[PDB]
Design an enzyme around this catalytic site. Structure first.
Site: not given
Lengths: 4, 182
Positions: B111, B164
């Site tokens: 991610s 992230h």
């Protein structure tokens, strides 16, 4: 754990 | 078909690793693939990247690969296999770096890279209507909600927040660089  | 080689090998690699983790256990696979967690592991170069290959829950792999298939696949088709390679290597290495800084080496997932692809496809649609790479309005919404859910920890297993931010940053920085062309 850490989710990316 | 809308999976280039690179979109495809990454999907494969992530599936194989996820199987390994169900069979051998998460810790066993981490031991082999985690960002270096000891001075003796620092020269094991695959580790600065292979933490991207590990998923810890079914929803994790599935959402990560859905976005990868889509944005990753858009990027490959319109801009070529090598662009996706480099977004991927850079996002994985840089997200991994910030994640372990804040929180230590026990982390994994595609991610960081999905965030790089989101920020990249968006900002490059906005500053270059001409790859035509773009992030469709409905999909900016689904991406924003995704971002939000991580930040405020809305999932119920906790999140690599460094990875992230770093991930999205890299994707923005590269869209910037790329669009600043002709």
């Amino acid at each position: 754990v850490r989710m990316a | 078909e809308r999976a280039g080689p690179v979109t495809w090998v990454m999907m494969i690699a992530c599936v194989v690793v996820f199987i390994a983790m169900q069979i051998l256990g998460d810790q066993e696979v981490m031991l082999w693939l985690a960002w270096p967690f000891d001075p003796t592991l620092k020269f094991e170069f695959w580790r600065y990247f292979t933490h991207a290959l590990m998923h810890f829950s079914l929803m994790h792999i599935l959402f990560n690969l859905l976005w990868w298939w889509y944005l990753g696949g858009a990027v490959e088709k319109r801009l070529g296999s090598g662009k996706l390679i480099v977004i991927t290597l850079i996002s994985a290495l840089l997200s991994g770096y910030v994640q372990q800084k804040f929180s230590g080496p026990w982390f994994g997932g595609l991610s960081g890279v999905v965030y790089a692809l989101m920020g990249y496809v968006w900002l490059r649609g906005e500053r270059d209507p001409q790859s035509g790479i773009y992030l469709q309005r409905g999909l900016i919404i689904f991406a924003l909600i995704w971002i939000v859910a991580g930040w405020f920890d809305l999932f119920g297993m906790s999140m690599a927040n460094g990875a992230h931010i770093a991930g999205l940053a890299v994707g923005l920085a590269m869209a910037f660089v790329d669009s600043l062309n002709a």
